[PDB]
Design a binder for this molecule. Structure first.
Ligand SMILES: Cc1cc(F)cc(C)c1Oc1ccc(C(C)(C)O)cc1-c1cn(C)c(=O)cc1NCC(=O)N[C@H]1CC[C@H](O)CC1
Ligand SMILES: Cc1cc(F)cc(C)c1Oc1ccc(C(C)(C)O)cc1-c1cn(C)c(=O)cc1NCC(=O)N[C@H]1CC[C@H](O)CC1
Ligand SMILES: Cc1cc(F)cc(C)c1Oc1ccc(C(C)(C)O)cc1-c1cn(C)c(=O)cc1NCC(=O)N[C@H]1CC[C@H](O)CC1
Lengths: 107, 109, 107
């Protein structure tokens, strides 16, 4: 199963990286005075959510979880100015994500 | 073509039922203490609620779809036993039972 | 039927209800018990609590990785504590039972 790989290798790699903490839970727009955030981002997403979806049999298959990881990154690129701290962090994780996703087994 | 039944019970059936206006009585167990109904757990031997059915889908409890379906049936039939026809609680259960039966008819193969 | 479902619904359920389970239903709180050495001696703590959260969220690659955890829990107990101790006899009762139930494992 590919879902096992995503939970046991991909997610675990990403979650232990030093740059993970901003994406381990939803962006708290309230704490940060961002009333624009949830208006600009209509599908918010995080490794918080992806984790619990993997642990609670939410996905139809692996490719829906992959779509969630892409959304999480692109959300970050949509809201934030290019080349900010936070954007570079997303890119480091996205590069690491694409590497890990190539070794994905088949069935 | 290749769809799992339990997935569908989760992503489609439970999800539809959960959002519906009349869903809240059934989203957690019936609280005997809060209502002072010390007879509920005597009369209703196997209690059940969408909240439990949800944890069971989320945590690999059920053996097959039949078993999840039966807990649905049980929740409704429990409610119909304990409360007497005409009550709002029963009408609400009757609405969700109908809808359940539609969504069950679309189930994978 | 499936081997992971068996472990969850039969093996764990039986072991969980049993009277000697309570010390193995959560980690060994080395803080509460003033046991500085426990996490130096026992390099992989394990307990039925953690196994359950593992079976319920989708941790295990296969049934054997669940079984190695059950065996770890028992041997961790046999290592840390002295033979004869109450806690050991409890684990021995649970081992006997665990093994009985594993002989009925599905094909
Ligand atoms: C604000 C911030 C400062 C920093 F140094 C590093 C990060 C990651 C920062 O971003 C976050 C910090 C904490 C949190 C918490 C944990 C509260 O949910 C979220 C973010 C944050 C996360 N993600 C994924 C984002 O895409 C964007 C985030 N933060 C946007 C942000 O707060 N921008 C400020 C807003 C005010 C501006 O005048 C100055 C910049
Ligand atoms: C009591 C009640 C009043 C109401 F207007 C609407 C509902 C759904 C009501 O039922 C419940 C309200 C709250 C809760 C909580 C959330 C506390 O578990 C449960 C019920 C309830 C839910 N289900 C599924 C049931 O089968 C039965 C429930 N409750 C029945 C009940 O309380 N009956 C007595 C019987 C005599 C009446 O004159 C006074 C109320
Ligand atoms: C200490 C104890 C006394 C007792 F009468 C029965 C048991 C099972 C006992 O062991 C435990 C009691 C509680 C807990 C909690 C729940 C808090 O994590 C754990 C244990 C315990 C569990 N398991 C599985 C172990 O392997 C070891 C445990 N603990 C043993 C322990 O603390 N030993 C000390 C060692 C020093 C001695 O002077 C006093 C006894």
């Amino acid at each position: 199963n590919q879902l096992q790989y995503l939970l046991r290798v991909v997610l675990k790699t990403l979650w232990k990286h030093q740059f993970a903490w901003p994406f381990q839970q939803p962006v708290d727009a309230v704490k940060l005075n961002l009333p624009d955030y949830y208006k600009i981002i209509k599908t918010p997403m995080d490794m918080g959510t992806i984790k619990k979806r993997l642990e609670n049999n939410y996905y139809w298959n692996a490719q829906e979880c992959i779509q969630d990881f892409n959304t999480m990154f692109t959300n970050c690129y949509i809201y934030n100015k290019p080349g900010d701290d936070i954007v570079l962090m997303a890119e480091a994780l996205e590069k690491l994500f694409l590497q890990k996703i190539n070794e994905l087994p088949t069935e």
